[PDB]
């Protein structure tokens, strides 16, 4: 009764990895196949013990460990395109760890994941993270309002947008969260009723003046 | 009772007397329908409202 | 073998079983033909099951809708009862239409009932909507609050985005393993 | 072996047992077919079981709702009766929709009733709401009061945030162990 | 062999099996003649299948239409009860014509209902529409907003392009393989 | 040989077989006399067949018309209900005349409904038409939208060329080969 | 049999620790599994003694002893990410303790937790605790007002917030209470109705609100 | 019991390529034939292992890997008209990869496609990608508006279009996305009515909209 025979007919949507603690890991892809694999280990038609992992929930579990032993650490995401050799994307411009105390982090992150073999840490730049989020938001012709501050950046999309700009914004944010993650740059899509889609002006004695971005909006008679 | 009705324009005193009659007209616009009142204005005015009322 | 409830319904017994299996106690659905279903638990598991019956108010009463208080078989029908019978079919059709979106498991929609304002000579006031939803987990449920507002903003006469409040949440953790029989 | 209550129904008996079992006395539910259930205790715990029943005023009376005082079987129906049968179905649908949130075990909603505004030409007053809730423990019940206010604000015509009062509380400690038979 | 539902309809059992087969558990449909179908599941799969009955609220209610609250066999028909039976059939014919487009599998349309424009002296107002659709994947579903908006804009007397709200999405991944029998 | 649908009719079963054969599964049409038809599929093709039943919403409802809500046997016929049958026979006749063109296989025409234009003091609004069509593969479908836009214009009182919206498309690739038996 | 066989089929959601006072401890991580494991020991299918511990209600138990025998102590949270060596988070700028009485405090906590072997005590700054709470509150674009005083800081979130900001606020306070707890920095989310929906008003130094063409409202500064 | 005979009668719509990991790949052309061939392997009338590929799902699968190991890359499309020799259309005026270090990219793209023999990477020009989009958007006489920014252009087609122009813009865009992808240039069709419909306004640097003969409104400069 092997594990690859206890799954479905198509033996290419799952992938069984051998563990170091004598436990087999099944790496699914989405939530629908995760309950397809948890049902086999729940009905109990298998002798030994096994676990099911996922890209979305091993990154939620590993940040709970990381923000207790390494607080104030700047990182983005862990990528599992090859699950026996993951890549840990660290921020270069916002931490000053040395080479030896980066290798201790690489060995203590390896002992946390018993299916991996060696975690490779690459240092990503911090300017291109917010640069590709602005250059990908200008390409869809969406109104936005970039707000910079120390250690993060936020893009606010207000206004009474119609149904195509809502769809292109929602289709772009979901394709950006998968690659970079929402640790550094955050999007703020929200609908309210003003025909001026976010921007606001006041008029006196010289023309119009571009006002500062704020929370109060003027409701639009139109 | 306010005797401040006299002014310079002939229509400016005319709008003031209409303001005295909107107190009665608001009773009359409440109960009548919206079908005879514009039918008796193309062929709001006061005189269109009483037979509809 | 000790009896807890009897005379239940088919849709009423699967909720009591779905609640008791969450708290690690088994149950047995015994049919009695005309008298209904019946639910029995073990004698070591009788003190906890009575406690969850008292806490969760089981069995659930049937869900109430406004069109049941004004049945259509009446000899006279005021316009108050025709608008209430109309609005109670709009808020059922809208919550059946909310379940066909991508990722929604359940929902519930409420309409603001304004019944005497259009009768009186005063103008009818604005209409308010409100909705709840349960999403499939793993979803970024902060971006989907704008799609429900876009969908049901244009489903009435003149609503604004400030008179719509959507409160939604992700579903609970899944219960897949068997409870386990008390060994004596 | 002594009896203390006979003729009780199913829901009344299941709330007498859950009261006695948390005060370390064990009751026995005995069916009697047509005549309903009956509850018997042992002989030394009878003086305490009578005391507890008097304090809790057992058996509990059936819940009373406003829609029962004005039945729909009357030949003539005043507009005070149609609004009283409408608001009593709205305050039932809102409390059946509050139990589908995350962590809520029980809820109870009250609406201010306005009956004299419709008979004459006076404008109606604002409408007031008030809710109760019981939450699962381990939950941050200080931040759960803003979602019930946002959900309740635009479920009516025009309310403010000072006319909505939510008073909620965590649930009691769980009773899971058996009482214990008295030795003699 | 533990049954969990019985007495269901033909279209209800096809909605229960397609939900259970998505979660790697297989069910058996057993006909009972006049008393409807019945769905049985295996004993190791009974705990999961009750949890998915509770989550997805199965069995499904029959889909409601606005023309069911006002039957045509009544002796007295109001102008409100004629305008609502008119819009409740335009709403079904438009969503039946949306399914013959190139790529739509299901759709649901909502016409804003106007009732309180006929009886009082208030003039009627602009009519709003709303739509939903599920497209086969591999299609550019961002460019197909303008075709549905163009088709809907000339099906009423006076609508604008910002009073129509179309929310559409691609379909889920297809389920082609069998669940598999639970061995022991 | 697991049955999945039964009690259908002649026009519904010829649709379910034509859809399932497009996705490489074969069905079996069984007549049953007065009880309608039945459709059985093979046991390896049963899991996918339930998935395409849930996806394509089968069995199809019969197509609705506006003239069915106001039947001729209703001897009380309002002027509101006589123009609804006059509209509903014009949109049923224009699409029967659109199918006799050169290359059109199917079509659908919607007309704007105005029923209260005779009872208020306001003049009636313009008329808005809309049409869908499906052409044969290989047709120059860009220049054939001006024959429909010219034919639809002077078929009413006074419509413009910006009040008619024609959204047409070509048919899919033909399905000619057999699905093939599941070899075991 | 063993304790891990009377629990569920999946042997991953429960950790069984051997005690020191001849007892066994089951460490759940939320309330649903705590109520799942207490029904086993409550119905009584086990001979010896066992207890069920948690993350929240174990942080509540050794704070009752620590607000009686060691008052005026500035700390944040006791983390149980691995239950055999918990971490005790003390404050740095508000304590007067030398090297000896931290080890004495460690020895008096090891006697309170019989399932643990050692307790690691680290010192955290009170500046980074209020800096990460302000930088996270600035990244979500929320209206806030900071109130500093000695031994605590509070953030007040007022206004007519919509339904997007009350979900972004709940997702931030719930992600922050898990790390730091409510001992130092406290959030006060209260939502009010807006006065100025359709009114005209003058803002700036001499501000007023015209509630009608003949009605001025001078708010107090 | 071969795979090419287990399918339908016409032995030309499918193509069976042998792999290198002991698998057999069937290459369908569109989605309907993809679901035609995935049903065969899913009903299980085949002993060995096989897989069904496409062109869109294979152009998205190795654009997710190429977002993890080769970020900040500028490319267009991977064409699979001959599946034993694919062509990787790289950008010329936006990359800095040399000759030797372009070889290891082709040697790592060959490992993700086990059916292909060798990937041929060729460099397409950049101003000829945006020149054909405008010269094809001008033959249909569509009113457009070009927005040039760094690393991508955007064409916005707004207004109250008629019914012929939606059909022509739907036939040109679907034939341009097929041969160029959506990485560089993106069209934004947008059907909306006239802004400020029955209102008279005074446009240009000091603007006001007249809601009525006795009403002025001073929003953003119209």
From Swiss-Prot, chains A, H:
- Domain of life, source organism: Bacteria
Is this entry keyworded Nucleus? no
Question: Which stretch of the intact protein is present?
Answer: 171 to 392 of 392
Entry protein name: Protein PrgH
Coarse class of the primary localization is: membrane
Q: Which Cys residues form disulphide pairs?
A: none
According to its record, how does it sit in the membrane? Single-pass membrane protein
Q: Looking at the keywords, is ATP-binding present?
A: no
Organism the protein comes from:
Salmonella typhimurium (strain LT2 / SGSC1412 / ATCC 700720)
Swiss-Prot record, chain B:
Q: Where in the cell is it found?
A: Cell membrane
Origin superkingdom? Bacteria
Q: What job does this protein perform? A: Involved in a secretory pathway responsible for the surface presentation of determinants needed for the entry of Salmonella species into mammalian cells.
Family the UniProt entry places it in: Belongs to the FliP/MopC/SpaP family.
The protein's name:
Surface presentation of antigens protein SpaP
Q: Which organism is it from?
A: Salmonella typhimurium (strain LT2 / SGSC1412 / ATCC 700720)
From Swiss-Prot, chains C, D, E, F:
Give compartment(s).
Cell outer membrane
Q: Name one GO biological process term.
A: protein secretion
Q: Which keywords are on file for this protein?
A: Cell outer membrane, Lipoprotein, Membrane, Palmitate, Protein transport, Signal, Transmembrane, Transmembrane helix, Transport, Virulence
Q: State what this protein does.
A: Required for invasion of epithelial cells. Could be involved in protein secretion.
Please tell me the species this chain comes from. Salmonella typhimurium (strain LT2 / SGSC1412 / ATCC 700720)
Per the annotation, which location comes first and is thus the protein's main one?
Answer: membrane
Quick check: keyword Cytoplasm in the entry?
Answer: no
Q: Show the GO cellular component annotation of the record.
A: cell outer membrane
Question: Origin, by domain of life?
Answer: Bacteria
Membrane protein topology class: Lipid-anchor
Q: What is this protein called?
A: Lipoprotein PrgK
Q: Does the keyword Transport apply?
A: yes
Record-stated family: Belongs to the YscJ lipoprotein family.
């Amino acid at each position: 009764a092997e594990l690859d025979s206890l799954l479905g007919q198509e033996k290419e949507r799952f992938q069984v990895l051998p563990g170091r603690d004598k436990m087999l890991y099944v790496a699914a892809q989405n939530e629908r196949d995760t309950l397809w694999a948890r049902q086999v280990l729940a009905r109990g038609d298998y002798d030994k013990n096994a676990r099911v992992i996922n890209e979305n929930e091993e990154n939620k579990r590993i940040s709970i460990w990381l923000d207790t032993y390494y607080p104030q650490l700047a990182y983005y995401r862990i990528h599992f395109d090859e699950p026996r050799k993951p890549v840990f994307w660290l921020s270069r411009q916002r931490n000053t760890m040395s080479k030896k105390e980066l290798e201790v982090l690489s060995q203590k992150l390896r002992a946390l994941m018993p299916y991996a073999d060696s975690v490779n840490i690459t240092l990503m730049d911090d300017v291109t993270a917010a640069g590709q989020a602005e250059a990908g938001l200008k390409q869809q012709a969406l109104p936005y309002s970039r707000r910079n501050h120390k250690g993060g950046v936020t893009f606010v999309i207000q206004g009474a947008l119609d149904d195509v700009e809502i769809l292109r914004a929602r289709q772009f944010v979901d394709s950006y969260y998968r690659t970079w993650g929402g640790r550094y740059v955050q999007f703020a899509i929200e609908l309210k009723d003003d025909w001026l889609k976010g921007r606001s002006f006041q008029y006196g004695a010289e023309g119009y003046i571009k006002m500062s971005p704020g929370h109060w909006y003027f409701p639009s008679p139109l | 009772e306010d005797e401040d009705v006299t002014f310079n324009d002939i229509s400016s005193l005319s709008k003031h007397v209409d303001e005295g009659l909107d107190g009665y007209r608001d009773y009359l616009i409440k109960y009548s329908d919206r079908e005879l009142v514009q039918f008796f204005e193309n062929a709001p005015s006061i005189f269109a409202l009483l037979p509809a009322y | 073998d000790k009896d807890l409830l009897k005379g239940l319904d088919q849709e009423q017994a699967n909720e009591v079983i779905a609640v008791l299996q969450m708290h690690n106690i088994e149950a047995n659905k015994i049919d009695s033909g005309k008298l209904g279903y019946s639910i029995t638990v073990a004698e070591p598991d009788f003190t906890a099951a009575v406690y969850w019956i008292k806490t969760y108010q089981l069995p659930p009463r049937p869900r109430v809708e406004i069109a049941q208080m004004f049945p259509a078989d009446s000899l006279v029908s005021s316009p108050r009862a025709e608008k209430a019978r109309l609005y109670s079919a709009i808020e059922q059709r809208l919550e059946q239409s909310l379940q066909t979106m991508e990722g929604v498991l359940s929902a519930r929609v409420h309409i603001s009932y304004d019944i005497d304002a259009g009768e009186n000579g005063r103008p009818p006031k604005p209409v308010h909507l409100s909705a709840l939803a349960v999403y499939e987990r793993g979803s970024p449920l902060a971006h989907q609050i704008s799609d429900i507002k876009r969908f049901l903003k244009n489903s009435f006469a003149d609503v604004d985005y400030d008179n719509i409040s959507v409160v939604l949440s992700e579903r609970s953790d899944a219960q897949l393993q068997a409870p386990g029989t008390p060994v004596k």
